[PDB]
From a paper:
The coat proteins (CPs) of single-stranded RNA bacteriophages (ssRNA phages) directly assemble around the genomic RNA (gRNA) to form a near-icosahedral capsid with a single maturation protein (Mat) that binds the gRNA and interacts with the retractile pilus during infection of the host. The canonical ssRNA phage Qβ has a genomic RNA (gRNA) of 4217 nucleotides, from the 5′ to the 3′ end, encoding the maturation protein (Mat); the major coat protein (CP); the minor capsid protein A1, which is a read-through extension caused by a leaky stop codon for the major CP; and the β-subunit of the RNA-dependent RNA replicase (Rep). Through a native infection without engineering the amino acid sequences, we found that Qβ CP can form diverse VLP capsids, including the T = 3 icosahedral, T = 4 icosahedral, prolate, oblate, and a small prolate form elongated along the 3-fold axis.
Further structural characterization of these smaller particles revealed two previously unreported forms of VLPs. One is the oblate form with T = 3 and Q = 2; the other is a small prolate form elongated along the 3-fold axis from the two T = 1 caps. When produced from an infection event, and purified via size-exclusion chromatography, the population of the oblate and the small prolate forms are around 21% and 3%, respectively. For example, one can convert an oblate capsid to a T = 3 capsid by separating the two end-shells from the equator and adding five more hexamers where the two half-shells rejoin.
Residue numbers in the entry:
A (entry chain M), B (entry chain F), C (entry chain O), D (entry chain H), E (entry chain K), F (entry chain D): 1 to 132
Amino acid sequence: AKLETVTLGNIGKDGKQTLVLNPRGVNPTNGVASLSQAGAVPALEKRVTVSVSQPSRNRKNYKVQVKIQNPTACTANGSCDPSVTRQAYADVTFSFTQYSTDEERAFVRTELAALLASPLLIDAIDQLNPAY
Amino acid sequence: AKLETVTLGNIGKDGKQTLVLNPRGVNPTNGVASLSQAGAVPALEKRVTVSVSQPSRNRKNYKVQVKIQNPTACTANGSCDPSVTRQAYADVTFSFTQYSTDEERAFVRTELAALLASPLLIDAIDQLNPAY
Amino acid sequence: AKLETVTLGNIGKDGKQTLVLNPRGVNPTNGVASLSQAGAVPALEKRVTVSVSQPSRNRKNYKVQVKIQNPTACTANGSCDPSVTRQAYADVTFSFTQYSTDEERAFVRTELAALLASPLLIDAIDQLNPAY
Amino acid sequence: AKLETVTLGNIGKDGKQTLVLNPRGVNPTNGVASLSQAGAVPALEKRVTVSVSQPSRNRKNYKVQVKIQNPTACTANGSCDPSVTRQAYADVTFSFTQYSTDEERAFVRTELAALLASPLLIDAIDQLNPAY
Amino acid sequence: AKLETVTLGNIGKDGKQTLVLNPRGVNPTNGVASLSQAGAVPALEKRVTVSVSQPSRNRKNYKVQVKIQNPTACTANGSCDPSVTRQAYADVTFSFTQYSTDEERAFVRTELAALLASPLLIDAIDQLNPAY
Amino acid sequence: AKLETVTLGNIGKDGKQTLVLNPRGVNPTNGVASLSQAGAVPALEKRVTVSVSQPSRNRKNYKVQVKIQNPTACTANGSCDPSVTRQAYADVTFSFTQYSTDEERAFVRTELAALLASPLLIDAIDQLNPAY
């Protein structure tokens, strides 16, 4: 990565749609890669922001982070320009020790993806169901 | 949503192992369940903690958080007690408003699992190679 | 050079529209051509300007500058007049040394037109879209 | 955007030559596209680069900046080695609002290509004729 | 000249060792490419960094610079965590004239590799002193 | 590490070139050994020089300075005093601790020569740096 385009498929409530984010680029103060929705509305686009520490000494207990932004907008009466009335977010971090291996980093990655995909969280999030 | 066990299949570097979590120690203060490997001490070491959000009050929105902790164990000779260091962690959160819908929630979480499975994050996590 | 109505055919993302900017004149304040389309208010909005800077005592080489003004307008309320909320524009400079010739002057114009036609700028402008 | 070799054909005084600008890696410290006549000595090299940026601190619009350079050298100017004697450049900046469509952004891009081909600029640029 | 996996071989004291370097991408902090071995395993740092410099307005220095970091660790008896006691380094810089060509630049690089492998430089640091 | 004439071959971008440098003795004030060209004018000679030591009170550790100087000149802007013209230059610094082993030093020398011989750097010093 090296990614010219990022496509997430099998998404949405029924697991049937796709989202294409194109890289905008990498931010040269932050060292942060940034993707956003391929649709032509810069004002109102889905975004993914990605960072990994060098690691530097104070970032040796390194972070890998992805920020997810999904605004929802509509057009107000009397305004040709649409705007966001609600926003949805997610924020995921790893890892953090310098002595972790790719295998452990992956377990955390997948013990996560496999949980996000599990009914516990599907209903705890989609219907705001307390666990009991 | 329910304090049922979770089978996290298809996990690890190649997506081929399984870990099973069993919820316990739910703290009524905040409705947060500790999901962990069932049995002995590893049950205390390898765990995922899951909160469930509820709308409004603080404020006109809500937040969901899951904490992942996977410690590395070893022990001194003659010790009565093993210990863990070089611990792997992750944190995933979600944020939505009080008027949010199920469809926008589904995209934020369904993307996220698809996003974790994307080379974007596989490289950012497994190698620590950000998409540069 | 001498002004005449400039008709720009085959324009817009689909290459189907035509813009017609009449040779209103040249502003003697600064030697700037004024080309516009057509109405009492719209001609003050849809505009192209042109000027030439000759080599000079300020130890300057020569250049040609072209400005593109493409504002649009939206809604109106009880105050009744419409207004511009958005504007697309460009500032186009052609820079040459004092001994530069016609061939070089022509290459810069045509290379740019070829580049504007090329996918690199189709995507830089229609999409996000910085390199990568 | 994505880089690939661009062949800027139908260029120059008679509209008959081609520049073949091969992709160069994109340096993240600015995210600038770089295509060039790579067989050239770097002090000569004919090159096209594109800089694209999003709104940020002190910046409200989206911008695309295009730089075209064509230095020309004398192969052996009383020497054995080439030395640049002539230079010619394009420096074009485009600017768009965040809420904007591709159709609209494209008009400024396409209008310029159509404009570059106009008799007004053929004379304003190739003969360096002032407006009149 | 591009991000790629680099495999070395026929290296080491007996000339029989191999090494594979997995890229980290290009770091926006300074626009510099880097690659490391596993790269997840060498928690104690095994790295190669490659510049990527530009013929800047204030320098015209588009040099190639490669930095090599090779630590050696000691295990503190019954330790769960090994640590570096020695660090070896190498730093190679290639300085160029702006009118230089590929064969000129290659003469120096190929000359250097041929020299590093020569008995004179091998003896000076394998066992001895400044040459005599 | 006695200086003796060093003959290099299989050098240049195509690996088709030789170079012979003869000992000129050693600079006694800094231990900088030198291999000279067989010509009459030092200004235009290709040469290689070397010195290795651990300073008594700038220590740190042991470092070696390996330097390549390749001046170029031509008689057209000559023939008298055909000055430089395409100067090429490179060097290597290596450093080791007092405990570095014999194989450690060998490893680093060979790792570097193997990298210099790698396609990554073969192309980096030529027409394109690994900006991406």
